[PDB]
């Protein structure tokens, strides 16, 4: 009966649409702009994410009962504010609330004010002030120019700090250097539906940020993920929930920025407890691809419950899920498009193939984005999942693509 619209074009959106299309409450599902893979489970709507004005009209004429925003951009432009001023129900944060992701300085500002555990952070335009500060926090310490160096010693730290200010980009306020506390521990992604002060935790997942095996290379939007994460104890998870997620939700509300949608915490389980690395104001990608398939509860039913302030208890499958990203060579740097992708039809039907940047033409598939696809497999254990996943990937033939082989290695071994 319901008409649902999903905004975005990546694998995270294929995941959301795929899950929504299974809701008995859904009468019809649209995704704008979506992608060729997504069209297999939803009708595509050829409107751009940032084209907020056209999106509003569509929602109105098509009687969209619920809209779910995938990417950060439209949120940052305030797609939620426009929709709400049109009586359109949308799951996502206002522009002011989305600042939790938009500005890292603001996130640090908020966390310090409300005592949310996170790595010490300080910006400087004066070398002397950065020096005095460095000599107070000791090393290893993180120095970030405008690039990132983990100074093993204080001397190295000062040398890198000086160089960051001397050779960094000259902003309108001159050059600047950021000094971040070095943290050690296991990283994890803790997402949760949020509406004002109510928090509804989702299962935990672990991202793989580095482009190459052994977490080598530059950072990416995420090269793979799995859920659950056995090595992160439930104590650590509960700690994160009560000292980070709930207090962050309360903090944003206390600041005239009540949050609605998916609060995504990039955390690190340190010996002293969980600590925030970063905050995202939407579903993580590829975290959505491995977490949603484990959600037994109806996603559309769950979302409406969050919006209607109803109590909710999400159920999860015992099976684990592990997904691997296939990216165009060069990603996250310059990459090419137009490489024919062969074998997608050879893939087992039990494999979860989420499209993130593909194109269809003359009855063929072609790379068309940084991250192109993600193949996830379900398994009784993470080990079984990892095996089924890589097993399927080998069926794909395309030299223009690459992917890490070590996804889930931290869980298994």
TrEMBL record:
Ligand binding (AMP 1): 181, 183, 187
GO biological process annotation, one example: purine nucleobase biosynthetic process
Binding site for AMP 2: 187
Keyword Metal-binding: yes
Catalytic activities: 5-phospho-beta-D-ribosylamine + glycine + ATP = N(1)-(5-phospho-beta-D-ribosyl)glycinamide + ADP + phosphate + H(+)
Origin superkingdom: Bacteria
UniProt keywords, alphabetically: ATP-binding, Ligase, Manganese, Metal-binding, Nucleotide-binding, Purine biosynthesis
PANTHER family, per database record: PHOSPHORIBOSYLAMINE--GLYCINE LIGASE, PHOSPHORIBOSYLAMINE--GLYCINE LIGASE, CHLOROPLASTIC
Protein name, UniProt field: Phosphoribosylamine--glycine ligase
Taxonomic classification: Bacteria, Bacillati, Bacillota, Bacilli, Bacillales
